[PDB]
Design a protein around this ligand. Structure first.
Ligand SMILES: Nc1ncnc2c1ncn2[C@@H]1O[C@H](COP(=O)(O)OP(=O)(O)O)[C@@H](O)[C@H]1O
Ligand SMILES: Nc1ncnc2c1ncn2[C@@H]1O[C@H](COP(=O)(O)OP(=O)(O)O)[C@@H](O)[C@H]1O
Ligand SMILES: Nc1ncnc2c1ncn2[C@@H]1O[C@H](COP(=O)(O)OP(=O)(O)O)[C@@H](O)[C@H]1O
Ligand SMILES: Nc1ncnc2c1ncn2[C@@H]1O[C@H](COP(=O)(O)OP(=O)(O)O)[C@@H](O)[C@H]1O
Ligand SMILES: [Mg+2]
Lengths: 410, 335, 369, 417
C-alpha cells in the first residue's frame, strides 16, 4: 500500500483528468483510508470497510478515467463492468473472476521486468553452447555478434465443449501438458531467442508466490468500477432491475468468491459506481446498497473552455498522440491556440446540434480533421504542418453545418 | 456453549436495542449445546429452531445474524430470496456456505502454522503439518453442526402469474429447511442441523401467506421495533468499534484528534432521522452517508491538521448538514 | 507488421475492389497505424489504440470485400459476424474465440507449407549421407537428381516434427490475434434504438468491452482485445450512427460513406479485378479445352441485365452478377465436355438470347435470378 | 479423388435412380464438374473459385433429396440433410459441419478398413501362431491348415487388451464426457481363454486399430470434407420473412458464414467450409427466393425448378428405379417363397390410386406410393408364409378390390392412407 496524502493524490490526477475536483477528492479519501486502515490495530482493521463512491454526472465527463488513473496510481487491479450486463444470463460473481485474472497478468508483467535482464542473459548463454560446444575468445566473439548483429536469421538447432465449458476445458489442457520444448529441434535465432526467453523466465518466476500475491492484490488493493448503475433502479422490468442489485449486494457487503487462482474475499475491495441519474435517482436504489455507497459526488458537465484543456493539458493527450504518430512518418504537426479553440467549438456544436455524447466527440472530430494528413503522412515527411483556425474551419465547418451529415460522420 | 444471557450480553456490544430478537437467537444457539448432551436417538429427532424476523428495513436484522455466527465461530451466508425467482439454483446457498467454511478453517490453520511450519521453514512445511484431507473434512463437520444461513426479504416470495414463481422459490427452499443432502465440490453436506434465519418487512404479505410446510419449519418468531432518534444517539457511541470510533481512529492515523460533543451527537442523529422521513427510510444506514458527508472536509485536510484537536460540536454539525437536509431534491443524491 | 504506405495499400486494394476510394483510404489509415505504433516508445504503445472504422452504405457495394482483402493483405486473422446473431442467446465472447480458432488454422497451414519443402529437403539429405558418406560436390548432386526423378515418408515425419512445434505454434497464433486481429461486424445498424430496444442496445453493451479492451478466455490461452481492429458496417437507412450508445461512438472514430454502384461499375467488376468472375469462367472452361471470350457489347449487356433485375425487384448489389452469369453459362457449362476444341463467341446477341426472355418476366426473375 | 466424370456422365448415372427432373440433374452435374475443373487451375485460381451452390424449387416428394443423395454417392462425398427450422428454437448452426465431419470420419474409417483388411488379418493369425508354436517348416503347416479348415472351434488362450467408470453429467455435457473417457483409454493386455472362431475376430479389431495411423485417417477425412463435402438444407423457404421474422432471418444470418466460407471447430480437428457444396430446397409457395437476405441470394447462383410428378411418373417410379418399392416387395415375399408379379394394368391403377388420394386430401408427393402399397399388400404380406409355392399376380382388378373401398372415403383416407 502506498503512503500518498489526499492532496498529493489529487495533484497527480491533475496531470490526467481536467477539472472535476470534487470527484478527485472523493477517490483520494477512499485511497487514503487504505493506508489509514493499515495503521490501526487488529480489531479495527476488520470493522472498517472501504468507503465506496457513487459518482453522478452526464456521460463523457471523466468518471471512468478518474478510476483508471487511480488504480494505475495505486498499483492496483482494476475492472470496468456494465450494470446492464447482468439483466439478461451471466453470474454477478464474474466481476471478481475477471478482476482476479487481470491481477494475475498484472503481477506477471511486473515480475518479468525485474527479472528480464537475467533471463535474457541465460537465453543467449544457451545459444552460445550450440555455436561453440564447450569464456576464452570464441564465446566472447559470438556473444558480441549476437547482440550487435542481425545474424539471428541463421538457422540453428537448439476438447469439444458447449459455450459454457470454454473455461474448464482450457484448464484440463494445462494439466496434460504438465504431466515438448526439451526435444532438440531446428529453429531460427530470431524465433529461438524469443522462445528461450520464455523458458528461462518461467523457471525464474515462482507460480506459488506470484499467484498468492495476486490474491493479496485483489483483496487488499482491489478496485471495481460499475458503469451505468443508474439503469438498474426501480421503475415487469423493475423486478429484474432490482434483482441485479440484490445479487450485487454480497459483493459490497463482503463475501467469498471462488476463482481458478484460489479463494478471493471481497471485503476490502473498493467499488466505484457511476451513472447519469436523469430518469431515476440514487434514492431509487435499494436501502442495503445505499448504505454501502457512503461517499457521493456529482461531476459537472464539461464546457468549451474544458475541451480546450483536454486537447493539450493531459499527459499523452490526443493532440499529443497524433503529434507523435505523424512524427513516425516524419511530419511535425503543430496546433495553434486559435486552432485548438475551433476544434473545441466544433465538438461543442455537434453535441448541441444532435446528441450530447460528452468529451468523446473530440475523438471523432479530430480523426475527421486529420484524415487527409494521416493518409498523406508518408508523403509529408520532413515537412512542418501547422494546424491553425483556418485549417480547422476548412475541413469541419462544411460538415458541422449539415446536421444530417453530423450524425453519420461525426 | 455460551449461556443464553451471556449471548445477549455479548450481542449488546454491537447491536443497540432489539432485545426480543437477541433472546430468540440465543435460544437457537443454546439448543445446539443442549442437543450435543442428548442421547443418540434424541440428537436426530431434535431439529434446530429456525427464526423468522419481522421488522422494517435497517433496524439490525442482518447485524444480529452476522454477530451471532461470528460469536459462535460458525459459517455464515446471506442470500436474497428474490434471487431464485428468475437462473441460479437454490442449492447454491449450501455451496457458498461450504466455500466460506473452507476459507474459515484455512485461516485458522494458517495462524497455527505460523510456528512449527515456520520453524522448519526458516530451518509447504505447513502442508506437511496441516493436511488438505483433514482440513477439508473438518470444514464439512463445521457446516453440518455449526452452519448458519440467513435468507433476506423472504416476504417478497409470498403470493396469479408471479405468485406461481414466487411460491416456487418456497417449494425449492423447502428441502433445505426440512433437511436433505446437497453435493458440493468440497464433499457431501447435510442440511439437517443447519440453522436458518428468515427476515422480511411483511407489509405487503403476512407470514400466514407462506406455504404451510414452511411455517412449521420456522417455529421461532420475533418482531423487531423500528429505531428512534434516541437509538441513533446510542448507536454512534455505545457499540464497540462504532462508526464514530472507527472515524476517530482513522483520523488519528494522520495525527488528528477528533472529539464529538454530546450536543453534536444529538444533532447528527436528528439529521439522519430527518432524511429518512423526508425522502426514504433506509434505517440506521443513513448514519453512514451523513457521517461521511459531514466529515469529508476533515478527512481530506487531515494530513495538514496533524497535531491538532478538532471539536465536533452542535454548531459544526448544523453548518455542514442543515443546508443539505433542507433541500429534499438534493438529499436523494447526496445522502 | 507490414511496412506498406497508405497509398500502396489503396493501390493493392484496387486490384480487387472497384471504386469506393473513400473506404479504401480509411482502411489504409487503420492498417498504417499498426506500423506507426510499433515505432513509438513503451508508454505510447499501450496508450495508442487502433482506430476502428464504421462504414455506411447500402448492401452489396463491397463493404465486406474491403475488409476481407485488407486482412488478407496484412496476413491478419479475420472473422465476419452478424450483429443480429446475439439478439439463451449466444455469448459475444465467441467472436474472439472463433477469431482465435481461425487464426490457429491460418498459421498452421502457413507453417505446414514452410515445412513441407524444408522437411522433404532434409529428409532426402540424410538419405544422401548413407549413399555418399562425406568426411556437396558432384557425387551428391548425381544421387540427388536420381532420387527425385528416378523410382522417405518416415524421414519426412521425423524432420517435420522438428521444424514445427505445437507449443510454438499456439503461442505464435496468439501474437497474431492480439496484435494483428481484425474483426468485421456486419449490419450493426440493426441493433440501434421499448422491449426490442432493450435487447438491441444490450448487444452494444455486450460488444462494448471488446472495443474498449478486455480479456477473453479461449482454449488456446488468454487473449487481450486491446489491440484488435474492429470494422463495423450498416445501411443506416432506418437509424443513424448517433442512435448508437455514446460509449460506442467514441470507439468508432473513423467514419466513411460508400456510394452505390452503377452500370459502369458492373462492367468493370466483370473484367478488371484479378481473377474476376469472367476470368474464372474462362479458366474453368479452359479445363475442358474451350476458349471463352466476352465481347465489349456482351459484357455491357451482362451488366445491364444485372442492373435491370436489381431495379425491377430487389437490389442485392454486385452479387446479382454471379447469378446472371451462371444462368447465361449454364448451357455452356453443361456442354463443355462435348464442345472441347471449339470456340463459341459470347456477343451482345448471345447475352440477349438467354437473358432478355427471363429478365422481361419479373415473376420468373425472382426465382431464377 | 475428384471424379473426372463429365456433366452428361453424371446425369446419365442419376437417371438410373431418379425419374425425370432433367433440369435439376443438369444443375447438380454442373456443380460436381467444377470440382474437377478447379483442381486443374493454378494455385491463385483455386482459392478464388467458389462452389456454385444450387437452390431447388418444387413441391414435396419430387426427388430433391434423392438427386442430392445419389449425387454424393456418385462422387464418394460426405453428405448431410438438416432442417432449417431446427435452428429457429436452440441448436447451434455450426452443428451442421460437426455432424457432417462425423459422418465423413466414419466413411473414411469403413473404407480404410475394407481396403487394409488383408494387412490386419496377417497380424491376427500370426499372433495365434505364436501360441500354437512358440519360438521353421512346422510353423508354416499350421498356418495353411487353419485357413482351409475349421479348426477354430478348439480352445486357445491368447493375450488381449482388457476402465469401467461412468461420469454423470447434465444433458449439455454429453459431448465432453465422451471425450474424457477417450483419454483414460489412451493412457495393457490381459490373458484370457477363448475360441479361435471368436478370438480371430477379436484380434482383427485390435490389429485394425493399431495398424492404421490416427493422423492420416483423421486428416484425409478433413480433406474429404473441405474438398469433396456436400451439405443439403431442406425447407429453407420456411426461414424467410415481424415477430418470427427476426428469428427466421437470424437463421440465415447464422448460416451465412457457412456459405461464405469460415472455420468451424470439431472434435476431429479443424474444418474449413470454403469449398463445401451447399444445396437448398423448398416449395416456395408461401415465399419467393427473392425474400432471402441479399448475402444469401448471391451465394446461391444455380437455380432450378423441379416439375411436379404426374400419373405417368408414378408408374415409372414403381418399376424403373433400381430396387424400387415393388421390386423390394417382390424380393421380400421371395424370402417366404411367394412369386409376386405386378401387371401393367395393376401398376397403372396403383398410380391412379395414389394420384386420387393426393388430389382428395393432401398432396404429399411420391411418398403416397408407400402407404398405398403396404395397404394393398397387407393381406399378402401377412399370409406370405402360408402362400409358399404360389404365384400371386397383382392385376388391375386386385388393386381396385383392396383400394377403391378406401380411396372413395376421404375421411378414411387421411387415417389409413
Ligand atoms: N476531465 C477530463 N480530462 C481529460 N480527459 C477526459 C476528461 N473527461 C473525459 N475525458 C476523456 O474521455 C474519455 C473517457 O471517458 P469516460 O471517463 O469513460 O466517460 P464517463 O466519465 O462518462 O465514464 C477518455 O479518453 C478521456 O480522454
Ligand atoms: N440496533 C442497531 N444497532 C447498531 N447498528 C444498527 C442497528 N440496526 C441497524 N444498524 C446498522 O445498520 C446496518 C445493518 O443493517 P441491516 O441489519 O442489514 O438492515 P436490516 O435489519 O433492514 O436487514 C449496520 O451497518 C448497522 O451499523
Ligand atoms: N467494389 C466492388 N468490386 C468488386 N466486387 C464487388 C464490389 N462490391 C461488391 N462486390 C461483390 O459483392 C460481393 C461482396 O459483397 P459484400 O461486400 O459482402 O456486400 P456488403 O458490402 O453489402 O456487405 C462479392 O462477391 C463481390 O464480388
Ligand atoms: N423422380 C424420381 N425418381 C425416382 N424416385 C423418386 C422420384 N421422386 C421421388 N421419388 C421417391 O419418392 C421419395 C421422395 O422423397 P424426397 O425426394 O426425399 O423428398 P423431397 O425431395 O420432397 O425432400 C424417395 O424415397 C424416392 O424414392
Ligand atoms: Mg448521409
Amino acid at each position: 500500500h502506498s503512503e500518498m496524502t489526499p492532496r498529493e493524490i489529487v495533484s497527480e490526477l491533475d496531470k490526467h483528468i481536467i477539472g472535476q475536483d470534487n470527484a478527485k477528492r472523493s477517490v483520494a479519501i477512499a485511497l487514503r483510508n487504505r493506508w489509514r486502515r493499515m495503521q490501526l490495530n487488529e480489531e479495527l482493521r476488520h470493522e472498517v470497510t472501504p468507503k465506496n463512491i457513487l459518482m453522478i454526472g452526464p456521460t463523457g465527463v471523466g468518471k471512468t478515467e478518474i478510476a483508471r488513473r487511480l488504480a494505475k496510481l495505486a498499483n492496483a487491479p482494476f475492472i470496468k463492468v456494465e450494470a446492464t450486463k447482468f439483466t439478461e444470463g451471466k453470474e454477478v460473481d464474474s466481476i471478481i473472476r475477471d478482476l482476479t485474472d487481470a491481477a494475475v497478468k498484472m503481477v506477471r508483467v511486473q515480475a518479468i521486468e525485474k527479472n528480464r535482464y537475467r533471463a535474457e542473459e541465460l537465453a543467449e548463454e544457451r545459444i552460445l553452447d550450440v555455436l561453440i560446444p564447450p569464456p576464452s575468445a570464441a564465446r566472447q566473439a559470438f556473444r558480441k555478434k549476437l547482440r550487435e548483429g542481425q545474424l539471428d536469421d541463421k538457422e540453428i538447432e537448439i476438447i469439444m465443449a458447449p459455450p459454457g465449458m470454454e473455461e474448464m476445458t482450457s484448464q484440463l489442457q494445462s494439466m496434460f501438458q504438465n504431466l515438448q520444448k526439451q526435444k532438440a529441434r531446428k529453429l531460427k535465432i530470431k524465433d529461438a531467442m524469443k522462445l528461450l526467453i520464455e523458458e528461462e523466465a518461467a523457471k525464474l518466476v515462482n507460480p506459488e508466490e506470484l499467484k498468492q500475491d495476486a490474491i493479496d492484490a485483489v483483496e487488499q488493493h482491489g478496485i471495481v468500477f460499475i458503469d451505468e448503475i443508474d439503469k438498474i433502479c426501480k421503475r415487469g422490468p423493475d423486478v429484474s432491475r432490482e434483482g441485479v442489485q440484490r445479487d450485487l449486494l454480497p459483493l459490497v457487503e463482503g463475501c467469498t468468491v471462488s476463482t481458478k487462482h484460489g479463494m478471493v474475499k471481497t471485503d476490502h475491495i473498493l467499488f466505484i459506481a457511476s451513472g447519469a441519474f436523469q430518469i431515476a435517482k440514487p434514492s431509487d436504489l435499494i436501502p442495503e446498497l445505499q448504505g454501502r455507497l457512503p461517499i457521493r459526488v456529482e461531476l459537472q458537465a464539461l464546457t468549451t473552455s474544458d475541451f480546450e484543456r483536454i486537447l493539450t493539458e493531459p499527459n499523452a493527450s490526443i493532440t499529443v498522440q497524433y503529434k507523435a504518430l505523424m512524427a513516425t512518418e516524419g511530419v511535425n504537426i503543430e496546433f495553434t491556440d486559435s486552432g485548438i479553440k475551433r476544434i473545441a467549438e466544433a465538438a461543442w456544436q455537434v453535441n448541441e446540434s444532435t446528441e450530447n455524447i460528452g468529451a468523446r466527440r473530440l475523438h471523432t472530430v479530430l480523426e475527421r480533421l486529420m484524415e487527409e494528413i494521416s493518409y498523406d503522412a508518408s508523403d509529408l515527411s520532413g515537412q512542418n504542418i501547422t494546424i491553425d483556425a483556418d485549417y480547422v474551419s476548412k475541413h469541419l465547418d462544411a460538415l458541422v453545418a449539415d446536421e444530417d451529415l453530423s450524425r453519420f460522420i461525426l
